[PDB]
Design a protein around this ligand. Sequence first.
Ligand SMILES: CNCCCN1c2ccccc2CCc2ccccc21
Ligand SMILES: [Cl-]
Length: 548
Amino acid sequence: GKKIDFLLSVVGFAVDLANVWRFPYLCYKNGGGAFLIPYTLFLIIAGMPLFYMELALGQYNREGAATVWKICPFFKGVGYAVILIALYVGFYYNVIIAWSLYYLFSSFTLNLPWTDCGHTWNSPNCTDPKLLYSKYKFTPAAEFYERGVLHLHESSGIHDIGLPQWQLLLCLMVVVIVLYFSLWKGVKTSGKVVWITATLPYFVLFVLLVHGVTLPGASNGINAYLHIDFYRLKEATVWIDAATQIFFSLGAGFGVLIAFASYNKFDNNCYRDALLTSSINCITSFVSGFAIFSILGYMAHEHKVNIEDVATEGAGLVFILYPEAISTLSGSTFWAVVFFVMLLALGLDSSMGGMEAVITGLADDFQVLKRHRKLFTFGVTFSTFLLALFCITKGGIYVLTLLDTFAAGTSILFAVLMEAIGVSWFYGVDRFSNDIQQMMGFRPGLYWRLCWKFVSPAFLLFVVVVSIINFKPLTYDDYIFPPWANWVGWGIALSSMVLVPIYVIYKFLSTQGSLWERLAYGITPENEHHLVAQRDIRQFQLQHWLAI
Ligand SMILES: CNCCCN1c2ccccc2CCc2ccccc21
Ligand SMILES: [Cl-]
């Protein structure tokens, strides 16, 4: 049972709302198959080594994202930045779970609300295929999503977001209460019911794939998915999106992997865990893309439009597509209930760890918080609830789009780049390899050390620079955000990016001694500070810097 339970746990972690909700519309937005080449390249080159590095760091040091930097005191700013990014993500990651809960509540009927027009939310322009360069938006499913759930028709833009929708308000309250009561006792919440949260997503995906392959237009969708537009690979939008999606999907750069690995056994095999998680993530993402493109190829045929204009390119793509596919199944109410229960379970389980990252990271830094986990959990959860109330307004989709663009973009790329630089160069890739050997019994291969020191940092720096210099003003379908929205988004990104230099400055100023003494204290592990008075600093020799 040692292996079956391990396989089930890794498969449960490898599937989340990233693959099922975000990856579909990022793949649709970037043409289809042309998004997979950069995705796989980044996966290998940067994602797998960084996942391995974070797991090893957490396992060896037994600390969270903030306090793990006792080895290199100058990067506690990086730790704080990743904690802040994790805090930002929840604000809308929980709004997506609220959407799922609302859809589940709406699915308890013999006539699904998204099957035809004729409802109070339907507009005169609603067009039903059965009863008779834009994104269409006049289908029953799109009309339901945008008017009976979002009520987006009551907001003219991000300047007129309006008041929170009360139904989504109740759903968000329920989600927040469930999160709090699942996090208020401690980190130990696995191995009890996660079994059904690990197999249900794959059963749902398999049934969706099998049924959608045999649909009238699925062939065209599959052809578009497998076609590669090589001109799209010369624009850097696909590359930036692929890098951000890889780091979001795998979970690196948020302080979650380090926090959870801090509770591992000192001899746990992090290499095997990283390999299996990455492989399962890639396969699941590919299958999700296949199913999604089959569904929208079917829709292109049914609605008599081009496949590029069938659906939205935003965060509601799955909430449009999956209901459309469900409506084609036999006994569609049962399948809708099953699918939205699966979405609820996936989202709640993932958000649990997402918030645990923040809680553990800040409790390791302050013991007062560690002594009062209930109050601290309540505070974190309540703050998330309010800043998510900001995202369930009539124009809450605009705020959600801005957040999904800026909270973890260049910010997360920069944070992961700083993490890799810190470890590999300042702490020492040789020291890191020695720690991994002391833990798991073998030294990492040359490929892993090369990726940690040279390859991953180079690609991360390139992608950060390209994302900064090739920045497209924010949009949502046919809506263009005002420039101040772009300024606000870049400010949100900087709020996390800037913690690193600020903490470097603060650590330098708060230390006592001469300039060289301050540097030695700042780049020396906290448990070897007695060697600084001995003028024996490894980093002050070329051997440390040329070591691989
Ligand atoms: C790993 N896929 C993302 C799943 C959710 N995610 C969350 C959730 C809420 C807040 C932050 C984050 C950061 C990324 C991450 C990392 C590990 C588990 C979950 C999450
Ligand atoms: Cl993904």
